[PDB]
Design a protein around this ligand. Structure first.
Ligand SMILES: CCCCCCCC/C=C/CCCCCCCC(=O)O
Length: 283
């Protein structure tokens, strides 16, 4: 008789149906401005965020969610009667949170716990949570769910075109960024997540027009092997997303296509004006 909890962080973009689910727990990710404002939804709205972004002369940072909060949540779940836990957090390659939480599995021996590296964030992450839920709701064993999710983690893809690369380079989530930045400044590169879940340059594309067109072509390639939920995601780049939406509408892919926003967590590392897509296998 499994009672399974789902833990994630606020970088995951959660489907509408899964939002307020009673087995879903969401850890907060702090943003650090001048030390000024800190947690979206408590202490900082998205509009205040962008206002604070424009006005600072230093870049914002983020920090890992609290190890102590996870620790205390795990203990709370154990006494709330949960038997298994699946933790689906932000990519290991863009935050050491995944590596940092691993010891916690040994510290709570009264639960069966899996923290697989999602290698993604935003909407694919949220889709994983949702997927694991329907799997649970389908009577599937913990190892099998974990299994299905790991193989799903393998088909997920995340491609990005940013407006300005400083956020990615100086924030440090673009790999080898300070060595390659001089080459990318005059152009509009297409970026993606690695096999290790790192952000690397997929392709040098010279113009923004061709960049977006190239994104639509990439979606068509990536989704050729099955049925995918597709998300266009932007940080105040409405027009770039509607454009890509139309490119994908034309290509025949309108049906599982949704436009969603980034929060301050990812805006911090991507900058404003960013556009991306993420795909996730259908459950
Ligand atoms: C479809 C996927 C597109 C989304 C691209 C997301 C890239 C942005 C990267 C986010 C990094 C935020 C990490 C928060 C933890 C802080 C880690 C630290 O400084 O100690």
């Amino acid at each position: 008789a499994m009672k399974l909890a789902l833990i994630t962080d606020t970088s995951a973009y959660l489907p509408e149906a899964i939002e307020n689910h009673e087995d879903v727990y969401v850890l907060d990710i702090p943003i650090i401005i001048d030390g000024k404002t800190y947690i979206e939804g408590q202490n900082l709205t998205l509009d205040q965020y962008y206002d604070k972004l424009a006005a600072s002369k230093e870049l914002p940072k983020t920090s890992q969610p609290s190890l102590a909060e996870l620790d205390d949540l795990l203990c709370q779940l154990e006494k709330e009667g949960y038997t298994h836990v699946l933790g689906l957090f932000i990519a290991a390659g863009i935050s050491g949170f995944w590596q940092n939480i691993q010891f916690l599995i040994e510290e709570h021996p009264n639960l069966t716990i899996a923290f697989p590296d999602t290698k993604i964030t935003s909407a694919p992450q949220g889709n994983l949570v949702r997927n694991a839920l329907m799997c649970s709701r389908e009577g599937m064993d913990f190892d099998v769910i974990v299994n299905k999710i790991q193989s799903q983690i393998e088909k997920i893809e995340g491609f990005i075109v940013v407006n300005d690369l400083n956020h990615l380079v100086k924030g440090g989530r673009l790999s080898n960024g300070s060595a390659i930045i001089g080459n990318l400044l005059s152009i509009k590169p297409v970026l993606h997540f690695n096999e290790e879940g790192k952000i690397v340059v997929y392709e040098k594309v010279r113009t923004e027009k061709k960049a977006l067109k190239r994104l639509a072509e990439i979606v068509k390639e990536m989704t050729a092997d099955g049925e995918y939920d597709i998300a266009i995601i932007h940080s105040r780049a409405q027009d770039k997303a509607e454009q890509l939406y139309n490119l994908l509408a034309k290509a025949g892919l309108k049906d599982d296509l949704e436009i969603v926003s980034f929060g301050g967590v990812i805006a911090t590392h991507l900058g404003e004006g960013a556009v991306a897509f993420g795909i996730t296998p259908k459950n």
